[PDB]
Design a protein around this ligand. Structure first.
Ligand SMILES: *[C@@H]1O[C@H](CO)[C@@H](O)[C@H](O)[C@H]1NC(C)=O
Ligand SMILES: *[C@@H]1O[C@H](CO)[C@@H](O)[C@H](O)[C@H]1NC(C)=O
Ligand SMILES: *[C@@H]1O[C@H](CO)[C@@H](O)[C@H](O)[C@H]1NC(C)=O
Ligand SMILES: *[C@@H]1O[C@H](CO)[C@@H](O)[C@H](O)[C@H]1NC(C)=O
Lengths: 165, 655, 109
């Protein structure tokens, strides 16, 4: 069975995720898709170069989990549909986490997050990509997830964490 | 409000602009973006948008044809007084001959004074156009018992005629034509483009049709316009010429039964659009000169034609015209009519004669019905009748000049009473003298074909009442090249145009009219100075005297009753009628005007009255005598002579 | 932007922004969306989370709106403001509405 520790898309969701830098990075959005607001975090700085844009989750209590499974849903608009491609445009973004026993609140610090993998969509071109990664063993009271942008044109739609019991 | 930045990807990457609402919205009050934002259904699903785009009729094709714009308004005259139509000061212009143009900036403000809705929110326009409200002018009419309606609504930039019909059940079939410069056409709203809706285009002009495919089907049953010619006629002609073109159609039509009960055919609906264009082209050429100045002579002509066109559209369809009238021009024109001695207008060149008569009718609204304009039209006719070879059909140039001056006079006969008895009854007498068998000949020909000759003739405002159908048939063109049906028609219209009743521009204005018992038995009425004569077959007449020529033993009668000092009597003179005293002791060579102010009638014992001449000058007398006019070879034709003393005298021979 | 191609549907009550709370409008291109003239209306930022409310708009409509706004207010027309008008007209002229018949319109959402 799957026990959900975090689900961005659903259920009265995002409510607090941290952006760094404040304003010039990831952007929170709202747009009715079937008839309803589905919220998303997106950033497309594809022509400004040297982009280090962070999005940090709220604090997630570990519970019993040894290994969590991180489910990501996202679109990635390719660089070719921006004329000046392969110069300052990327088509990946980086997934990190950081374990903590305590809630550090808003005090985000980027030299304390470890990278998990590079997220690539496996079909760059309706094409809502679904990537899943697992991290373990988790050994603290809880953890954070963080999303690094290096200059891609990305929209995160669903971020779902669970463990198998 | 706020301000809005537009980020738009074009050429592959972002270009952003900023729309200031606050700033824009204060510089042009009357802008309501939130009302426009509503009119544009911005959350329209592409399904609903494409369905409504396929509701509007699209045009086949038929792209550009080389049409030449004419030269309508001339460049300002050499050293001209530029007149501000708002500030119309007295003395600004001294004379007719003085050059003058009227500033086109404040003139258009007066033509287009109205503000109303140009683009409604009614079903056919709510789909294609963004609603509009602007300074405009409209002709509007109603036929078929306020069921089929037309409104030609125009600005200085583009014209929109909109046809509408009601089907006894609520439905409304609507079709609109849009004419004007392409860049000056109103803003389209949906996915629409003008090339899909253009029915004709030439060199910055276009004719746009806007209607439903459904409504297009309805109209095609009774309205198949030649939109190519309507575009080519509307672009290539000058504003004045085109205006005359329309008013001739309506004037000739009206003499037929074409306006007592107008039909829903192609022609009548077409002319409805042509009517609107005629007003548009004038207001267009004025507005389209920008800030400038428009030659007063051009204005004198173009707006003359609009005044006469406005009139005929009212007495024919019952149409209303709001706008295209400027009080500045009416004041300016009336000023120049106090410059002119109406007693001697006929002494001017026949171009300034026409330039004065055109200002006379442009300036009538604020001139008064006791202005001496009547004498001016009477003067022109006299100078014309002196230089006219007797009994001949009027020339092209003369007939046009008299037509211009005639409208003034027709606003006396079609005006209950007057104070111009001397000049009016003189104009009506010279008109009775001008129209002979050959003048009628060229009019019927000019009517049968449709040319300018049938538009106007002095016979139309003359005193002849003996013009029965078969009387005219003995004067019609007999050439096989003409159509006898058109010639048969041409007689009726010509006979319809003089029928005393239900016309109201013929009679009941002379004080001698009272002494006639039967008003249908009159034949001809010659007013001279100090006497009028009442020639009729009617016996019971209160004239002073009474004469009977030996008419024949076929025809009813020929009586001649001279009314003295335009005062009738208390009962028909009794006893066997008098005898016309014959005259043989009279020589053909004269050196004096003894017959001045005398009419010289010429009739036939079977046919009836044939020719009338009023001897106004020594020249008119020399023509009669020196020519072959006196032909006694035919015994059936006698030559009466109507004096100012009230005596009728037959000339049977000469020396 | 980061999600250009949306689906236009009538908000149909009480979800509007109505252009008093619109501050940015994105217009897709002739090649960006396979020929669909789509727009996205946005708010400046809301509250703590700083979210930008976005609805999907019919491009051809919204384009023709600004075009008429400019024409209607032709006097003021600052140099770039009238360079928008000609950019908008050409952009509107770049899309074909007769190519929208041989297509599916629910391709998105
Ligand atoms: C807007 O479009 C919808 C279809 O999406 C239509 O039902 C509605 O009548 C339109 N609104 C107006 C004011 O025309
Ligand atoms: C009219 O007649 C009177 C007398 O009969 C005469 O004195 C007068 O001069 C006449 N008028 C004209 C214009 O001939
Ligand atoms: C943003 O919206 C929230 C409600 O979702 C409200 O609490 C907040 O005051 C808004 N921010 C403003 C009005 O600046
Ligand atoms: C795209 O736009 C260009 C001009 O910007 C035009 O030439 C081309 O035909 C357009 N493509 C289509 C499929 O209409």
């Amino acid at each position: 069975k799957e026990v959900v520790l975090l689900d961005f898309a659903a259920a009265g969701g995002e409510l607090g995720w941290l952006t760094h830098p404040y304003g010039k990075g990831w952007d929170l959005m709202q747009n009715i898709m079937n008839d309803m607001p589905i919220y998303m975090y997106s950033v497309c700085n594809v022509m400004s170069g040297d982009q280090d844009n962070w999005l940090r989750t709220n604090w997630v209590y570990r519970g019993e989990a040894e290994r969590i499974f991180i489910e990501l849903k996202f679109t990635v608009r390719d660089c070719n549909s921006f004329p000046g491609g392969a110069s300052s445009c990327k088509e990946t973004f980086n997934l990190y986490y950081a374990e903590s026993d305590l809630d550090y609140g808003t005090n985000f610090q980027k030299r304390l997050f470890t990278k998990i993998d590079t997220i690539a969509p496996d079909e760059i071109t309706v094409k809502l990509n679904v990537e899943e990664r697992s991290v373990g063993p988790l050994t603290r009271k809880g953890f954070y997830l963080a999303f690094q942008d290096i200059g891609a044109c990305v929209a995160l739609l669903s971020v779902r964490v669970y463990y198998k019991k | 409000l706020s301000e809005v930045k537009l980020h738009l990807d074009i050429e592959g990457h972002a270009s952003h602009y900023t729309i200031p609402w606050t700033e824009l919205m204060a510089k042009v009050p009357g802008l309501s973006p939130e009302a426009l934002w509503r009119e544009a259904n911005v959350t329209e699903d592409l399904a609903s948008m494409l369905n409504r785009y396929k509701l509007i009729y699209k045009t086949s094709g038929t792209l550009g044809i080389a049409l030449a714009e004419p030269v309508d308004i001339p460049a300002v005259s050499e050293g001209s007084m530029q007149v501000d139509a708002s500030k119309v000061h007295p003395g600004v212009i001294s004379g007719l001959n003085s050059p003058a143009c009227m500033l086109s900036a404040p003139l258009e403000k007066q033509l287009f004074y109205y503000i109303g809705t140009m683009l409604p929110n009614t079903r056919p326009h709510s789909y294609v156009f963004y609603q509009l409200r602007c300074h405009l002018s409209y002709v509007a009419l109603s036929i078929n018992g306020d069921k089929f309606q037309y409104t030609g609504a125009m600005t200085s930039k583009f014209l929109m005629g909109t046809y509408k019909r009601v089907t006894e059940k609520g439905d409304e079939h609507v079709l609109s034509l849009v004419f004007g410069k392409t860049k000056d056409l109103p803003d389209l709203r949906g996915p629409f483009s003008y090339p899909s809706l253009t029915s004709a285009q030439s060199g910055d002009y276009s004719l746009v049709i806007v209607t439903t495919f459904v409504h297009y089907a309805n109209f095609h049953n009774y309205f198949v316009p030649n939109l190519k010619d309507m575009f080519s006629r509307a672009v290539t002609m000058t504003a004045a010429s085109y205006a005359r073109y329309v008013l001739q159609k309506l004037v000739l039509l009206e003499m037929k039964g074409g306006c007592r009960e107008p039909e829903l055919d192609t022609e009548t609906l077409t002319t409805m659009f042509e009517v609107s264009v005629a007003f548009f082209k004038v207001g267009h050429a004025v507005g389209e000169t920008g800030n400038g100045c428009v030659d007063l002579r051009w204005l004198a002509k173009s707006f003359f034609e609009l005044t006469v066109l406005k009139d005929i559209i009212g007495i024919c369809y019952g149409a209303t015209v709001k706008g295209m009238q400027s009080y500045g021009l009416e004041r300016l024109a009336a000023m120049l009519m106090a410059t002119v001695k109406m007693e001697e207008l006929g002494h001017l060149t026949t171009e300034k004669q026409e330039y004065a008569l055109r200002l006379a009718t442009v300036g009538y609204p604020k001139a008064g019905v006791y202005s001496g304009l009547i004498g001016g039209a009477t003067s022109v006719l006299l100078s014309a009748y002196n230089r006219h070879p007797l009994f001949q059909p009027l020339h092209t140039v003369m007939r046009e000049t008299l037509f211009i001056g005639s409208h003034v006079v027709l606003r006396e006969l079609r005006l209950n009473v007057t104070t111009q008895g001397p000049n009016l009854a003189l104009y009506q007498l010279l008109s009775t003298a001008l129209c002979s068998a050959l003048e009628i000949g060229e009019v019927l020909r000019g009517l049968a074909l449709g040319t300018e000759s049938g538009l106007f003739s002095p016979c139309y405002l003359s005193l002849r009442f003996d013009l029965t159908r078969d009387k005219l048939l003995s004067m019609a063109p007999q050439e096989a090249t003409l159509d006898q049906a058109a010639v048969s028609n041409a007689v009726d219209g010509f006979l319809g145009r003089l029928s005393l009743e239900r016309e109201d521009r013929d009679a009941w204005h002379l004080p001698a009219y009272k002494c006639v018992d039967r008003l249908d038995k009159v034949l001809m009425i010659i007013p001279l100075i100090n006497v009028t004569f009442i020639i009729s077959s009617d016996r019971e007449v209160r004239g002073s005297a009474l004469y009977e020529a030996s008419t024949t033993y076929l025809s009813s009668s020929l009586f001649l009753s001279p009314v003295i000092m335009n005062k009738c009597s208390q009962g028909a003179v009794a006893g066997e009628p008098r005898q016309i005293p014959k005259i043989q002791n009279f020589t053909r060579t004269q050196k004096s005007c003894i017959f001045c102010g005398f009419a010289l009638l010429s009739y036939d014992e079977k046919e009836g009255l044939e020719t009338t001449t009023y001897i106004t000058s020594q020249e008119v007398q020399n023509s009669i005598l020196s020519s072959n006019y006196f032909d006694f070879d035919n015994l059936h034709v006698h030559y009466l002579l109507l004096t100012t003393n009230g005596t009728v005298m037959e000339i049977a021979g000469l020396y | 932007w980061a999600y250009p191609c949306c689906h236009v549907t009538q908000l149909r009550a009480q979800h509007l922004l109505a252009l008093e709370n619109i501050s940015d409008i994105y217009l897709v291109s002739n090649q960006t969306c396979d020929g669909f003239s789509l727009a996205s209306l946005n708010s400046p930022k809301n509250g703590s989370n700083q979210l930008v409310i976005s609805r999907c708009a019919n491009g051809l409509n919204v384009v023709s709106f600004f075009i008429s706004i400019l024409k209607r207010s032709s006097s003021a027309l600052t140099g770039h403001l009238r360079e928008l008008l000609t950019t908008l007209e050409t952009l509107y002229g770049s899309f074909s509405v007769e190519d929208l018949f041989g297509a599916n319109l629910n391709r998105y959402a």
